[PDB]
Design a protein around this ligand. Sequence first.
Ligand code: CL
Ligand code: MG
Ligand code: MG
Ligand code: MG
Ligand code: MG
Lengths: 195, 195, 125, 228, 226, 222, 204, 212, 196, 196
Amino acid sequence: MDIILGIRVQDSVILASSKAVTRGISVLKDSDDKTRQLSPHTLMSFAGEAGDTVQFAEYIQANIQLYSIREDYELSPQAVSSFVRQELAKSIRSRRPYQVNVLIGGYDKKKNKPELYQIDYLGTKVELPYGAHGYSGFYTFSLLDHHYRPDMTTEEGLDLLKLCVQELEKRMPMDFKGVIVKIVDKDGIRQVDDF
Amino acid sequence: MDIILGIRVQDSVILASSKAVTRGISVLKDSDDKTRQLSPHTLMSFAGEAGDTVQFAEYIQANIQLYSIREDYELSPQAVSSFVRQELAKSIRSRRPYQVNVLIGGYDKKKNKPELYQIDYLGTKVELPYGAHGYSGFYTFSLLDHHYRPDMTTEEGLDLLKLCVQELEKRMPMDFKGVIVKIVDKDGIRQVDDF
Amino acid sequence: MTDRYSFSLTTFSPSGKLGQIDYALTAVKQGVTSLGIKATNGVVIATEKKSSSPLAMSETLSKVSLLTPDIGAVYSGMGPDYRVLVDKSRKVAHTSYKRIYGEYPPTKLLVSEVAKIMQEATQSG
Amino acid sequence: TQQPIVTGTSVISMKYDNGVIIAADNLGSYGSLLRFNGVERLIPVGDNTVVGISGDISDMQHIERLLKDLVTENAYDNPLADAEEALEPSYIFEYLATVMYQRRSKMNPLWNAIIVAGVQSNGDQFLRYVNLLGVTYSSPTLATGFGAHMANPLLRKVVDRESDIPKTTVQVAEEAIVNAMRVLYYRDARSSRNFSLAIIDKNTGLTFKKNLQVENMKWDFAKDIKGY
Amino acid sequence: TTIVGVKFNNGVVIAADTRSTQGPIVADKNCAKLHRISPKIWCAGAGTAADTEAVTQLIGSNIELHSLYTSREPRVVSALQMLKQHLFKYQGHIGAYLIVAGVDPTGSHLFSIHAHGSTDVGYYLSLGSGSLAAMAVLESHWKQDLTKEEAIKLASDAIQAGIWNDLGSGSNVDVCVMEIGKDAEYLRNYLTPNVREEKQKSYKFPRGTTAVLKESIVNICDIQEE
Amino acid sequence: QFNPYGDNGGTILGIAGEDFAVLAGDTRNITDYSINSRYEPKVFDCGDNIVMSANGFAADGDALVKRFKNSVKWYHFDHNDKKLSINSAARNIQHLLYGKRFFPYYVHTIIAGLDEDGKGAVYSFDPVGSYEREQCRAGGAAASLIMPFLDNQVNFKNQYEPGTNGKVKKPLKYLSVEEVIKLVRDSFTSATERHIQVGDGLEILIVTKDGVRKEFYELKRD
Amino acid sequence: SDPSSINGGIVVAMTGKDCVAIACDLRLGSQSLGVSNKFEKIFHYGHVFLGITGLATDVTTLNEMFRYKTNLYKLKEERAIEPETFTQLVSSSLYERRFGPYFVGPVVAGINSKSGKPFIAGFDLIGCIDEAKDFIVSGTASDQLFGMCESLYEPNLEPEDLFETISQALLNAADRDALSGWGAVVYIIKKDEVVKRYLKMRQD
Amino acid sequence: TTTLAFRFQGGIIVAVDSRATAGNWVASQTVKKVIEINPFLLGTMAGGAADCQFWETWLGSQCRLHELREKERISVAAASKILSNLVYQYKGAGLSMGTMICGYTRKEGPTIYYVDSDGTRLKGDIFCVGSGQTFAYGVLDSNYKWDLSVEDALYLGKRSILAAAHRDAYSGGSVNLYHVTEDGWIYHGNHDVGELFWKVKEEEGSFNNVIG
Amino acid sequence: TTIMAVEFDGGVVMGSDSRVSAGEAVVNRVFDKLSPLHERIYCALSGSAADTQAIADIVQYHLELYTSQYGTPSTETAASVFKELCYENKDNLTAGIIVAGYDDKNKGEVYTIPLGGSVHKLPYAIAGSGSTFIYGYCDKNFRENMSKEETVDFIKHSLSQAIKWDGSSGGVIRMVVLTAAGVERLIFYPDEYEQL
Amino acid sequence: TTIMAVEFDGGVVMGSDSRVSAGEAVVNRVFDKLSPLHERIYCALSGSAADTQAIADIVQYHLELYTSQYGTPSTETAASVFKELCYENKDNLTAGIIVAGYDDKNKGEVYTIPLGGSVHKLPYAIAGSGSTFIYGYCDKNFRENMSKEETVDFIKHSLSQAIKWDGSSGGVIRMVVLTAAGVERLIFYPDEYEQL
Ligand SMILES: [Cl-]
Ligand SMILES: [Mg+2]
Ligand SMILES: [Mg+2]
Ligand SMILES: [Mg+2]
Ligand SMILES: [Mg+2]
């Protein structure tokens, strides 16, 4: 499937997601943003079966936006991840399960801490310093295991992420047409427009 | 192996062949030459099932080099292509057929004409102004059908080939790690070392 | 057992003669006279039915044999050698022609096939 | 979806000048076992219709009950049940044809081939076919299963086109049917010697013949055949 | 395909239709299914057309050689034995279903043979997609001590049943009559009851209707002198 | 396993004239190599100057034609006896066919009549209700044998004017009802010779402003 | 997957008055992909013409095989092979591969040099001979050709009339087949002159 | 089948082929593969002819109900999403559909959404769908600019279908051209591929490989 | 197929029906299933028509060759040649064979060779599709040292029942009587055996 | 399983073996296959033990509820209730049922309901795996208007043969005699019926 990486540094979470959308023979698009803002300080990247990915992401987004209005309050990243896990855990024993894997990068404004949650289509949740889905981990985790330090700056996090993407572009057979990078911190969500 | 292109211009034949060798998950090499010189003025590019491709190419090479020594004479490109077709036509009804597709680019020193032959694993031979194997034709033939002139120069042929490779690098899902380009003319076979 | 005679029994003598072919021609010379005459609208082949005994029924011994509907053969020399050649000639007309082209061979080509069988008995082991 | 268990073979029929004839042997087969020898497969509906059924016998007995129920229902609040508002062959057929197609469309068919033979109010010969798929067709001659292959060719030599129907007498038509039943007994491995024959005439009404046998059989040439 | 063989007083008659089909499509509207093994031994083939034709010519070839070797006219039981032993060896992979009939010094004979190498004897036989249609007519009208005229009539009537009622059969009726002490008479298109009606219109085009790019003389002659 | 579908063979042909339309079909009904009926009508007058044929599986064919005829009857009841236009009939049949998208009517459907300008009209449907107005459409067993002939002899495809050599096409001159019927008869005569499932009889329904007329012609019965 | 419809293409042969015609499209493809528009499917050995449809590798192989055999025939017989004899050779050659056959639909056309009688024949892939008087069809649009030929054909057509009939039969059949077209050639064969005409047709 | 649609300065160009095939057999050469949802919205037909026809006609009904209720032209975004949400409900059932929803509104400008039967909904500038899509992409990619004139853009769309029609066995018959403006789509005719090929070959000097 | 052989005082009697079936179509309704190997040795064939006819031809060849060298073969010898062919080629054959013969030393003998290619010497043997319906009847009506007439009645009644119930069986009942006197062919038509 | 019902002068007699098999293993060698639904209406069960027992229980309940309302049901009525269950659930059932009962107006009656769920009223019926071996014997030996003793001997001899040949059958022969006098249960042990 498509590559979605995540790395939690000192004061922010960084989500990198491929831009390619391939339908069998042809690459239909090379600028696809595989992410949805769930709340001002929570971002979710996704990869899986065509159609199901966006349908699930927008469904979650709608539910978190509904809660935000009802209570006039932003749910903690932990609370949002738990809600998403339950929805995927419910989905696997459904008539037609969502084949969707997600990373949830959020900044908890109460604890003043960045948080990264990795949830697969089964509803398998784990909190990680850095995560991936599909084959992305196989190429990148050896580099992250070596270089990652919990007191890394955002700039150091982006540099380690560039080394991860470079290794993917070298050894992965598929052309994923680069990655859109987004940072989640105390000030909210912004996109790195040059990568 | 993946993409092999051929274009016959006014006074030469140009063969472009991808550098990537992928074994399932990883790209093992990015500098593979998918060609063998059969005789001083005949070059054969190849793509198909792993092992069979090189085994077949080297077998053909040996047989043409043997003929060259025995008769002290270089077979015409037409004669070489007919020999290669018969070997593949023999192979398809064997216990285990050679799963190999080939382009044969040769310069006939008698007729003073460049000649490009396309032969698939079944032994389906055609003489073409430009050819390809697999999915390479699907992306490139619309550009070649448009721009190709029979009075084209070698430099014009290379320019059209660059446009073909650019379209492949845009719309093909697989990263084939660029192409090695070789020219076959009256002076023999040389490699374009910057492409 | 096994046929351990894998070598030629016919060989060139110092004078360049193939003895066994010469001696075979001597056997033909001793044989009863047979002839053939070609007309504009047909061919005739004839021989004498030299009956070995008057008790023998010489109608049961065929010296003139049909090879194909349009080809006939007569001989001079050793009768048994002729009989097996007729059997081989009739079969080769089918195997090496009729079963390929769906028609009987022309005279010259069937003669060519019989000739080839008789040449091989001159060089084979 | 099921598979047929206890089965009946060919039902054969043809039109003649004044009415229709239909026939079917009295056998209920259980694969290659000739298990039941006293099965009636021609079921009369009133005095103007005979429904002949081949295929699954359990589904035949169900259809037999539907028709019995149809006669009862028609008689309810119907002073002309035995006159103008009596069941027509065309009514009985269309009902069965509806049921057959509905059942195939639920993927739960009645595993049968049915021929409805009868004479209409205006004296018009009725003869139409319907099977487990709900496929329907009419013809001067109709036959099911093995009959289609062997009976039709013989019956079509009597009545080939529609124009032959007025030229065909009941004696010629019955003779042809009885000969076809003998040929089917010779050549069908799941046929019996005993059969029923029904004539529906616009003048003489419904004649139902039970316990008919195949006779005048040729076997005497068997003694001559020696070896293979 | 509809093929029948019928025994009569002083010989045997074989008949067949003239339609060869590529599935639903009719390839030849006047095919010849009546093959000659030997001058007075004819057979007719259903199943794989190439196989029936090929297996006849092979046995027909070997029968001719056997006849020359033995100085005797070929027998039907010989053709029979050679056909079944050949077909059995290939375990039905040669899809040749034949009705073999003929006369020889022994008398008149009628056999059938299936692709797997089984054989059948009888006074009347049928074969092919139209065999049931044909066998219905044979079972209705056959009797012991048929005359030549009655047998030809019964045979052709049995083929007609196939032509009309079987989609696999059609067009014309071929017949071959093999009577003892006589030459076998091969009657090709004995019946022609399926002639196409004149079309409503002529489809002959005006000359120059087709667009042409190039023209050239093709050299079919050898290399010339001088 | 139970197979709810079968093949009853048959071939149908619809041609739209300038001020008329014909829908023709052979009267033969078959399963495998057997003939069920030599005359089983396949082309039906559905009222409102519309003729319809649903060729393929005869059960699904009879079911669809029955339901459309029913749709015409209820269109009259619901909309003050308004005449159902051919374009409105076509769209209605799409909804009937697509209604069973996931258990289709195994039929190729053709309807013929006049549009609301009085010009000849033919509509062609796939089993699941995709439809298009066409000048010329054959359906069923021998469709592949007929259409190439109609391309050549109706639309004058690959025909050019003598002397020009490919430069000027043969002009598309309008055909009379007599001219169309000749091409229909020759189509079915040719189809009968080369296709085993085609023969017995040909029934043609001609639609003009005056109403629906029928013509029947014998075909070879082999 | 089906070997007889990978490459595509058609051949048709017809008989006229003292003449025969054989015609073929020029397309070679890899299923949906058009590869060549110059792949001629009609060959000749002396005055006998052979068209071959089906798997292109076998088309080329059988041409090389029949050239081989007819060349040896001529050297031994001291005369060019006739259509009737060549038909039997094709039949023989195909059936000798009964259980591993060439995936081809061959078509023989020519005039007997002695009798002057026009001759055509067709074969299935294992060598069964279809010797029709009227016409022979072969390839991925054989159904379409059967339709065209059955309606367009009438017997005893003069050479220049037969050309128009076989040309229209091929062109309109090819235009109703995805895997046929991309050009067409027609041979008009008389006892001692043969004309070869390339037809202009749509290139889709 | 070959269908494309691309965004430019002048609006949207939509180009399609006309061929329909059942196996090797060419069923139709006169198929409308552009569905006129309403005077301002176009949709392309690829995959299931019935699926595309039926559901994009249905979309035209939903779009009409929207503007009756909201008294405002439906956005291309909203129109595309009604269809993508509908086919997503039928996911697994076996709907086959690959289509581009095209429209030009005030708030959006010229907009194209690729909608697909496994539930995909992509906004984009250039989309190609069908058996001959790869051929069309080649011509599009090498010639496409935003600042194309309406005349040149129409030709590029026509030339791209011709490229596919030539090479792809399952594409051809004729080319249908549409130009989508803010005030609605304009039909730019039916062009026979047979006649177009020879015309383009001569005037352009392309397809030298083919003899004419 | 319905075939059986019975050992009696005089010698042995073999019986059979005459029906050859392809699915539900009777291909031949008067087939002779009693084919001789030697003068007073006969076989009854069940299973694949091709396989059984091919084997029967090979045995007849072996017994003809045997006779030329070693004189008249025993019924045991005939059964042994059958078993050898059936057992060695069990993977490619579907043949169930009953062998019945008459020596002057051994008198009447019956051997059965089922699918496996085993041999069983029995006082009487039943085989073919129809035999399953008459296991009960045959077991309770077979006696040893019956007369010729009694043995004819026993086989006639037995095959009658097996024809009545088995769709794969029918036609005429043929019988071959092997005694010191020689060989006698008998035939019984439906009209006779149906009313038993 | 071997089961059979026979119509005679006095009334009807039902017979059965007593073997229940799971592959080659005899699970129970003394099972009672004759189950009463009413006082003088019994059923013999063949096929799926689960399916047959389940249906028998329901029919018994239906005839009990019938009796409470409408009085004693006819044997025809009992057969009809079975057919309804077997026919309507033919896709999920493997049951072959013989129904034998005694009215005073109808006297002895036998009905068979095979796999399909069809009904056949017969003078006598045979069913189960063992029945195939005694079609010949039963057809030859059955008479109408036999005595009680004759009918017991006919069933004893019939099931004896069917037990002898069928591996799925064996144990004791249980019989139930339905007459005006009432219900009589009979048992016959191997040592008795084997020597017949
Ligand atoms: Cl070429
Ligand atoms: Mg016909
Ligand atoms: Mg085409
Ligand atoms: Mg194309
Ligand atoms: Mg019987």
